[PDB]
Design a protein around this nucleic acid. Structure first.
Ligand SMILES: [Zn+2]
Lengths: 59, 116, 70, 973
RNA sequence: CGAGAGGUA
DNA sequence: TTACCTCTCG
């Protein structure tokens, strides 16, 4: 007779593009550099320059 | 969010904030969604509302309210069940539309584009 | 649970708030289930001649629920 | 917050480890740097750790691979030197050096090479008690103290109370004397220790005495003590406590430890290794700084802080680690699965770790503590079997080195449930069940029984007494085992083989998805790095084969694509677009697909019609017969790219003005690629020259010899000799290709693509294939794809049979093919022979399974040699197909030839063919002329060498022959 | 050429 | 244990 767990759960259409922003997937991954820059751990080129120049002026 | 862009583009508001927006002036259409973490059908609405946002970027404001946090407001706005949306117009003479249930994305677009 | 992350909302289904251990629903759903479990059902109501309305009648007709009183 | 409610990302461990090193690790190592002054007093150097800044990379990642650079970051820190003479302060920020950066996927690009760091498992510091059965009478007991240093501390008690330290090679050393060394009074000891009478009757610091935080906590738990965590020393009270426990065992009150348990082991990672290296480098900077201070004295010059410090020590340390450490390895890029699997690996071996030949049999078996943490099936066979393994899907790494498996609490509480992660030790004390609640009798549900684990054992208990439940489908297995469909029905031995074979698959020219799968193919594609995913939301404004433009809220972002590029394993990478112009996308959604991926899922093979039956012996043992359709419709064709590089008649047709072969040339073996010093094609390479790169270089003393690289592409079709496999442990080599007319055919008229032997399943115990072939046939007919999770029989008995049989019936009814489901013999049908038109006698199994093509191909394998180049010292032929070499006749082969009695054949192998210079040069001539080859009299070089080597150690070996006829003795040279 | 690492059967 | 293959690195 018919199966107790429904077979619909199993079926996927043959021409389907998976949606990664769906209920069963983890949050989107972040580029390490951008993450590190957002939290301040790595600084930009302009910032070293700004700091370096001011230090030179002080000296 | 300078380097990393936020994933979620629909924001939670409160009863007081909703009231200001309504009493004040607006120039683009307002859509308000009532939701609860507990309802299963709602998990599906959230995905749809986030897409409408990408499409109509500054041509609409889509906002969200949680029933657990603001139960009394919901009763006053006459909400009878959980997946419910209120579409409000930038003109203040026109009536607002309440839709109950999961409804398709095209219907949402038609209301915004034609009726509101 | 979290306001935005809906991948976490499933946990509430696993441990449900009590009022919604077995959530009930619209009258249309009972009819579709009755037909599936064997049985014959009819739905009485009014729907518009708009697009959504036609979709609903189609679903019911396809599931074999008598739609004459709509 | 992650992994509860979803499967965790496959690279999460690497991401977290790198972050810890960047902030916490860097600061901790920096602090220890010593203020340096010299002699009676000298100038003082200050490294202010308060202000450290890491700056962004100068080159982008793609450029680094193109120019063979290393992607890194620059560390600038502030410092001040008060020259002893000056009494004034100068401050600047010195560029200490470059620290490498990681991509999110978890790789590092160093000198142009993608590199990955593997995790290691080692014994944790702490006190361990073992009972050694004693050769005479009563058993000896012992304690031991593992340390970060690795020194072990031994204390022992004999039948007569001994309490003697075993650290000295000598039998007797006194633990009590060590206590007295601590200044403890004999009286003080007595008051402290229980079991005083027994001890009454009885009337370093740098390495062993330091116990890490992990070491201290373990000590406190095993011997209950509560010295605070900041304390991290071998304080003496502990030694007394240890002795007290040691005697309790002698009287019966104790636990002997299990050292294979994971509560006693610790995991090192990217972070630990990187921090360690930073320390080594830092000590090297102190040596350099002291030295430049001395130089300043000679020149009597005012130092600039920068002048004192160079950037060499930081860069060199890392360059060496990445290049030479055992646990830093190059990434396998054969397919997308290989890239994801490499990171998750765990090794017992490594530096400061076990060696394979040395290790015990017991370390290589599964322990009950491994569940949920380390996969039972995956291991590397060989002398290394059992020592290299893989992390399970839902595992994470804890605050301490230990791993953790998620568990659901079913015990009543307000919320009533939470998912918690448990340390290897904590969960031995709870009852965990994996069964379900679908049983009811005349009593209530709570009284029903279920199988469960408790204290490393399996028992049956009621549902009331269970505390935790295991709920996730893929929890106990790794990524490879979790990609096999119907695993429940395949014996476990096969599963090892199967995980291994998927890793060896070749990305094909056109890709197709499977009809039957398990559902983890979707996440495996997201985490591989082969797909292009959106970084921001937007609408697609322009698409070209090279690029995509995404336009979101007033910005336009350009995303580059990959066209026809080589990989470390000579395979091709190519991305193809999935998004039509004008479409909205949300962050994280797919934009382009990579190789071996279609529609967001991993696709390593194709779906083909197959029959399982005997066919004229072509399928004997494990061989396959295939149709020509596969060859002419291009189902199994693959592209392979190789690189050939150098440092700076008909042939030379291709070369350009500079002499480098032009793009678009077809080249064959022998042809020069780049103009005496000419680079020429080896045997078996024949392809279009897709690209030439004259790369200018830096780093060498001379401008680095510009490197000219040529890249050549070969398109390869299926051939006799190729290896093909399915996902259930089934492997075979192609033996014949036959025309469609001669192939076996069905009642629909169609001809089967492949034919497999049916005698294989009983021996190998895989019944999974039969379930998969049949479901495949159904899906093709009904247009459905099925993704089924493992262990379906939890729901009901015989669940899989119910799914397959039901689906086959629907297909049979909807498309009216009655042969698809036959009521008398379900799953089997009657087919006919192409050659004669006659029916085969008994019904046969027909289906469409998914078959993959493996990396081991015939073209790479074939080799031959006649004559050729010979080695310098041994003067024997060279080794290797690349080197055009010979094959070995070794010890075992000689023995076999001797058994036959074939002396002449053997002599030949030892002399003319290998290493007899005079003799070898003659045989080529005799053969061209047509003559006879004489039997050699002189010795081969091999022997001559031995004599010379011995004569170097002052010993003489001579060979003499005594003539039988006249008795003369003659010395051969 | 000396080491190291990943495979195969 | 045998044989086989690829690579990097000073
Ligand atoms: Zn099953």
């Amino acid at each position: 007779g018919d199966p107790v767990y429904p077979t619909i759960n199993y079926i996927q259409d043959p021409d389907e593009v998976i949606d990664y922003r769906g209920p069963d997937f983890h949050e989107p991954t972040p580029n390490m550099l951008a993450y590190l820059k957002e939290h301040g751990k790595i600084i930009s080129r302009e910032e070293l320059e700004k700091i370096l120049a001011k230090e030179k002026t002080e000296e | 969010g300078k380097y990393v862009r936020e994933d979620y583009l629909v924001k939670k508001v409160s009863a007081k904030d909703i009231q200001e927006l309504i009493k004040g002036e607006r120039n683009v259409p307002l859509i308000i969604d009532f939701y609860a973490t507990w309802c299963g059908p709602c998990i599906l609405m959230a995905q749809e509302l986030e897409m409408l946002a990408v499409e109509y970027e500054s041509n609409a404001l889509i906002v969200k309210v949680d029933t657990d946090d603001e139960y009394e407001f919901a009763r006053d706005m006459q909400v009878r069940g959980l997946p419910t949306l209120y579409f409000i117009s930038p003109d203040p003479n026109k009536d607002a539309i309440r839709t109950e249930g999961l409804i398709p994305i095209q219907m949402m677009r038609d209301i915004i584009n034609n009726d509101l | 649970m979290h306001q935005d992350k809906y991948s976490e909302w499933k946990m509430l289904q696993w441990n449900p708030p009590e009022f919604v251990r077995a959530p009930g629903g619209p009258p249309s759903n009972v009819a579709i289930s009755h037909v599936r479990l064997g049985g014959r059902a009819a739905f009485m109501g009014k729907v518009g001649n708009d697009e959504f309305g036609q979709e609903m009648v189609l679903l019911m007709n396809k599931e074999k629920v008598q739609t004459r009183a709509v | 917050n992650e992994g509860i409610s979803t499967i965790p990302g496959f690279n999460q461990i690497q991401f977290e480890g790198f972050c810890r090193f960047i902030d916490q690790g860097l600061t901790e190592e920096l602090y220890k740097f010593p203020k340096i002054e010299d002699t009676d007093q000298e100038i003082e150097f200050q490294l202010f750790v308060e202000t450290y800044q890491l700056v962004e990379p100068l080159i982008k990642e793609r450029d680094a691979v193109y120019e063979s650079l290393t992607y890194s970051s620059e560390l600038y820190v502030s410092a001040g030197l008060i020259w002893k003479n000056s009494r004034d302060m100068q401050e600047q920020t010195i560029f200490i050096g470059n620290i490498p950066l990681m991509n999110s996927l978890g790789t590092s690009i160093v000198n142009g090479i993608y590199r990955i760091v593997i995790n290691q498992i080692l014994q944790s510091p702490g006190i361990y008690y073992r009972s050694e059965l004693d050769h005479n009478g009563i058993s000896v007991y012992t304690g031991t103290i593992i340390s970060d240093w690795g020194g072990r501390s031994e204390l022992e008690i004999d039948r007569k109370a001994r309490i003697w330290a075993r650290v000295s090679r000598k039998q007797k050393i006194s633990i009590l004397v060590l206590s007295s060394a601590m200044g403890l009074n004999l009286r003080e000891i007595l008051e402290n220790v229980c079991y005083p009478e027994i001890f009454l009757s009885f009337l370093f610091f740098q390495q062993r005495c330091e116990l890490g935080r992990i070491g201290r906590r373990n000590m406190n738990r095993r011997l209950n003590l509560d010295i605070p965590q900041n304390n991290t020393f071998l304080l003496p009270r502990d030694i007394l406590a240890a002795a007290d426990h040691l005697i309790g065992l002698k009287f019966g009150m104790g636990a002997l430890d299990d050292m294979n348990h994971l509560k006693n082991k610790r995991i090192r990672s990217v972070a630990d290794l990187l921090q360690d290296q930073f320390g080594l480098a830092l000590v090297r900077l102190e040596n350099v700084v002291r030295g430049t201070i001395c130089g300043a004295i000679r020149h009597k010059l005012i130092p600039t802080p920068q002048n004192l410090v160079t950037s060499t020590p930081l860069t060199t340390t890392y360059e060496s680690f990445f290049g030479l450490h055992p646990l830093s390895q190059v990434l396998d890029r054969t397919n997308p699965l290989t890239q994801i699997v490499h990171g998750r690996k765990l090794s017992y071996l490594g530096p400061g770790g076990l060696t394979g030949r040395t290790a015990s049999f017991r370390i290589r078996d599964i322990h009950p503590s491994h569940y949920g943490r380390i996969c039972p099936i995956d291991t590397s066979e060989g002398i290394n079997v059992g020592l290299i393994g893989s992390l399970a899907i839902h595992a994470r790494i804890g605050h301490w080195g230990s791993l953790e498996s998620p568990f659901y609490e079913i015990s009543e509480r307000s919320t009533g449930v939470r998912m918690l992660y448990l340390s290897p030790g904590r969960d031995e004390y709870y009852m965990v069940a994996a069964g379900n609640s679908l049983a009811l009798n005349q009593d209530i549900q709570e009284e029903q029984v279920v199988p469960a684990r408790y204290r490393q054992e399996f028992l049956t208990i009621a549902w009331e007494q269970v505390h935790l439940r295991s709920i996730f489908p893929f929890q106990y297995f790794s990524i490879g085992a979790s990609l096999i469909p119907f695993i429940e029905h395949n014996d476990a031995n096969r599963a090892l083989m199967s995980s291994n074979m998927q890793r060896q698959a070749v990305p094909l020219s056109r890709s197709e998805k499977c009809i039957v799968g398990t559902g983890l193919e979707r996440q495996a594609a997201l985490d591989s790095g082969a797909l292009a995913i959106a970084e921001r939301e937007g609408r697609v404004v322009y698409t070209n084969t090279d690029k995509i433009l995404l336009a979101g809220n007033g910005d336009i972002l350009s995303i580059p694509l990959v066209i026809y590029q080589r990989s470390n394993k000579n395979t091709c990478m190519h991305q193809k677009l999935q998004v039509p112009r004008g479409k909205c996308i949300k962050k994280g959604q797919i934009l382009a697909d990579g190789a071996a991926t279609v529609g967001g899922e991993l696709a390593l093979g194709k779906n083909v019609l197959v029959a399982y039956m005997p066919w004229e012996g072509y399928n004997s043992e494990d061989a396959v017969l295939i149709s020509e359709r596969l060859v002419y419709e291009d189902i199994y064709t693959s592209f392979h790219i190789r690189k050939y590089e150098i440092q700076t008649a008909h042939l030379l047709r291709n070369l350009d003005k500079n002499g480098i072969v032009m793009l678009g040339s077809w080249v064959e073996t022998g042809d020069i690629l780049v103009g005496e010093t000419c680079l020429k094609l080896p045997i078996g390479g024949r392809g279009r020259v897709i690209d030439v790169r004259w790369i200018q270089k830096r780093g060498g003393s001379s401008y680095n010899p510009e490197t000219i690289r040529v890249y050549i592409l070969q398109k390869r079709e299926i051939k006799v000799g190729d290896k093909v496999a399915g996902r259930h442990g089934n492997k075979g080599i192609i033996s014949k290709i036959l025309p469609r007319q001669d192939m076996p055919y069905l009642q629909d008229g169609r001809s089967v693509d492949m034919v497999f032997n049916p005698l294989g399943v009983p021996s190998r115990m895989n019944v999974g294939q039969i379930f998969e072939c049949s479901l495949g046939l159904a899906g093709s007919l009904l247009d459905r794809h099925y993704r089924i999770a493992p262990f379906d029989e939890r729901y009901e008995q015989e669940a899989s049979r119910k799914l397959v049989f039901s689906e086959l019936y629907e297909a049979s009814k909807q498309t009216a093919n009655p042969w698809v489901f036959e009521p008398e013999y379900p799953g089997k049908s009657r087919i006919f022979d192409g050659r004669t038109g006659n029916p085969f006698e008994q019904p046969v199994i027909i289906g469409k399974p998914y078959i993959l093509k493996l990396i081991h191909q015939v073209d790479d394998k074939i080799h031959g040699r006649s004559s050729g180049h010979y080695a310098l010292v041994t003067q024997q032929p060279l080794r290797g197909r690349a080197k055009q070499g010979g094959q070995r006749v070794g010890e075992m082969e000689v023995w076999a030839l001797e058994g036959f009695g074939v002396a002449h054949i053997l002599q030949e192998m030892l002399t003319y063919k290998s290493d007899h210079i005079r003799a070898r040069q003659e045989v080529l001539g005799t053969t061209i002329i047509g003559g006879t080859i004489p039997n050699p009299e002189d010795a081969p070089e091999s022997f001559r060498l031995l004599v010379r080597e011995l004569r170097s150690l002052a010993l003489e070996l001579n060979h003499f022959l005594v003539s039988e006829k006249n008795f003369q003795i003659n010395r051969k040279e």
